[PDB]
Amino acid sequence: AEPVYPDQLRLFSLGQGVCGDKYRPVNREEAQSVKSNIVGMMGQWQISGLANGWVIMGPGYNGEIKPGTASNTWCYPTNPVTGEIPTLSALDIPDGDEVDVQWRLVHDSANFIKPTSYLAHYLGYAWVGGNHSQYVGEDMDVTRDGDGWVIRGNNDGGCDGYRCGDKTAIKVSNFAYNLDPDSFKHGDVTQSDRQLVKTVVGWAVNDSDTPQSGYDVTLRYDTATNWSKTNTYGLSEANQSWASQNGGSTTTSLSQSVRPTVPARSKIPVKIELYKADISYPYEFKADVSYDLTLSGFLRWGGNAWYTHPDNRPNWNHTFVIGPYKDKASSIRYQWDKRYIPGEVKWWDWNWTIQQNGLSTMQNNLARVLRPVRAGITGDFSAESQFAGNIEIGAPVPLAA
Amino acid sequence: AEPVYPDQLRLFSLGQGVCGDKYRPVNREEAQSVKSNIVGMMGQWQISGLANGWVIMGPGYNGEIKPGTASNTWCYPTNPVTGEIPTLSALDIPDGDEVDVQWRLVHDSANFIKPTSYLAHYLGYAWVGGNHSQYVGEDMDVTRDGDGWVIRGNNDGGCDGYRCGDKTAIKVSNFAYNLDPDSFKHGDVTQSDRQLVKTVVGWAVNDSDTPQSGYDVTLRYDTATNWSKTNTYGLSEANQSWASQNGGSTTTSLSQSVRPTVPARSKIPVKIELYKADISYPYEFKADVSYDLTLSGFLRWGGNAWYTHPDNRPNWNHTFVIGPYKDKASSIRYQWDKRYIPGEVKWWDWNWTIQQNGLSTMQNNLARVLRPVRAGITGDFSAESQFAGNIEIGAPVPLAA
Amino acid sequence: HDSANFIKPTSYLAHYLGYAWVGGNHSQYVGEDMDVTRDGDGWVIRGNNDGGC
Amino acid sequence: SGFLRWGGNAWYTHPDNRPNWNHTFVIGPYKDKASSIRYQWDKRYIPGEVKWW
């Protein structure tokens, strides 16, 4: 048939048939996804009209579904629903230095840290918000590590509840750029040093009345490192012996050559040079910002969507990747595919979060979280001992044939 | 919102609202950068109107910021400011030999050593200036090391203060050239010696009535060095044994070949020669000069911008790179990005230097330091055992098909 | 866990060295306020870090 | 492990400001200067080799 979206199912006490206005009765096929999952909607001894001659039994009957009829029919509105996070409008970030850009994203209060922290609560974390008031995720404070940013409200003054302080945190990890091909300014290029590696100088002549083809000359330079690792076995601590090894190696190589075409009856001077040293460019370009999200412990007991929520009480850490990826558990949009169908979630019960916070609640907030970040990156580039060189074909000297 | 530039913040005793003419009240967002940093502008028990229902508490309250109102409102002029070092006008250096050029840069008194040494003082160094008078950085004297230049005023005659002599120094390190593509004269090329490596002589003929393609002949020469390094383990000082190795190697290679196209019905003589030995060119070209700056100890106690200025008293060495690079701490322009926003400076408190010397003071002097050096480099080039060779296609002999 | 001939000593070292420390339920410098926990490999001792202060 | 109160010094070129420290001591025969205690103790009193740690 066609998968059902759990929170659209409804139970009616209409005896048998259809319900509401468009709510068709649930079939034996759907029962596969209904199994287990739906039990949260009924009591131990609560049985219910699956339909088509079937009744769902509750926990007291070990969750079995048997033939027969009841008066509590489960029905489903037979209408398509928004099974995805709504249109990610857009985010306009002003141009600036890469880290300056990071700051503006990080500090965009209600449009950034707000809904993020709201999820933390919805998700199942405990101390979400600073020492100021009773609002979820409000008054978070921000600091920075050279390799990331940390959101964590002030830990001073007033403090109550179970465990004083021990606040949860939102950390900004790595990030990347959807370097939009429509724009990219490469700036001036230089080197910052010198070191001669090797050169070659020579020439070729055409002692004929016809133009010739290539006078190929190549200058090449290779580097390599090796990695050996051998284990051997003699007398168990003998004659028969073992030796085994894991490698291996890596190399780099740089060539460069001329393919000059001397004109009839002439001499051509040729030079190739190879150096090594530092290089630098400046950017600048516009791109969509990809954003990594890290959440720290600890969990709110009794309000966790994580499957293992039957027990324990605290430090559950996890990261997400905010962008167009399918890196399993890190993809929030991917996770919606587990709301319906499989028990193979490999993460958390999103249906639980729906019945706790409301579908539209999170539905909206998730868009606030996931929408694209459009920005212009200013700044530059530098690198250590890279390679550099040049090739030239000098002017012809009218003397040969 | 939009980062604030610390030294533009002002406190007014106007109760509540706005200040001056355009000074808007500071928001809760800005408070993140205000935190810690701003404390230097107030006393232990000094509290102040953050605004929007918030008050900043001083050191006596452990630096917390709480809800409420005061009469000391912090405001900000809501106008964009020159958050960078001003236009680097230009510097006209006359053409001369590379080292001759270095001399002119080094000895350009008021336009070079002056503002540099002024920074040394502003920066936080102690004995800045020679034994002559009471002026900062005046009467510095210059000497030279084959690999760099040293600025250091005479150490004789009059001398007082804490520690006699022990002057600070300004050293000129490496430098590089923005070889502007608009000009580059390659001069005459020669070798300074000979040594035959290997040659090959031969020929090819066309015994048909049609022109042929390539008669490829290649002469190749390779060199290589190896690097082995193995550690092994027997009886802990046994049967089971370990061996591990780090590599690796490097090679150089030089080819060269002919791709001659013999005309129908003929004979072509071919020769390829390979030699090794010294080579030389002369330049000459114009370029922008990149300049490395090294400062020696020792620090002026009580007047240091370096974060660790709460204690100790002397030898703090550090280098800068004067040019378009992002090599972290060595980039003065990059450093301005830490004046505002992060506590993650990884260097010195530039805001401290502003409140001590004046913004416009340093603002101007930094340009005097960082402006481009335009110059023409005269001189030449030499190198040891490089490779050299030649290729020739001799005149055709009318005899084949 | 004995701590009387171990921590009440050690904690004085900490304080004497000049480390920031208070005990959840005590105004004393001595490590009276604390208990023993573990990370399997070794052990950790901490003064509650509960209650207001 | 933790933060320095204000004054104090276990192995640092102090005075300092208000940061952490996080280092160890070896209570044993292992003669290793940076964590010896007894060595450190026996040395300062002789030349002032080290700072106020």
Curated annotation (Swiss-Prot), chains A, B:
Keywords: Disulfide bond, Host cell membrane, Host membrane, Membrane, Secreted, Signal, Toxin, Transmembrane, Transmembrane beta strand, Virulence. The record marks H132 as: Important for oligomerization. Residues 45-61 are annotated as: Interaction with host N-linked glycan. GO terms for biological process: symbiont-mediated cytolysis of host cell. Homodimer in solution; homoheptamer in the host membrane. After binding to GPI-anchored proteins in target membranes and proteolytic removal of the C-terminal propeptide, the protein assembles into a heptameric pre-pore complex. A further conformation change leads to insertion into the host membrane. Belongs to the aerolysin family. Secreted, cytolytic toxin that forms pores in host membranes after proteolytic removal of a C-terminal propeptide, leading to destruction of the membrane permeability barrier and host cell death. The pores are formed by transmembrane beta-strands and are approximately 3 nm in diameter. This is Aerolysin. The lineage of its organism: Bacteria, Pseudomonadati, Pseudomonadota, Gammaproteobacteria, Aeromonadales.
UniProtKB/Swiss-Prot annotation, chain D:
Residues 5-14 are annotated as: Interaction with glycans from host GPI-anchor. Changing E49A: Nearly abolishes heptamerization. The record marks K33, E49 as: Important for heptamerization. The C-terminal propeptide is required for normal protein folding and secretion; it maintains the aerolysin precursor in its soluble form and prevents premature heptamerization and pore formation. Belongs to the aerolysin family. Secreted, cytolytic toxin that forms pores in host membranes after proteolytic removal of a C-terminal propeptide, leading to destruction of the membrane permeability barrier and host cell death. The pores are formed by transmembrane beta-strands and are approximately 3 nm in diameter. Homodimer in solution; homoheptamer in the host membrane. After binding to GPI-anchored proteins in target membranes and proteolytic removal of the C-terminal propeptide, the protein assembles into a heptameric pre-pore complex. A further conformation change leads to insertion into the host membrane. This is Aerolysin. The gene is aerA. The chain holds residues 342 to 394 of 493 of the full protein.
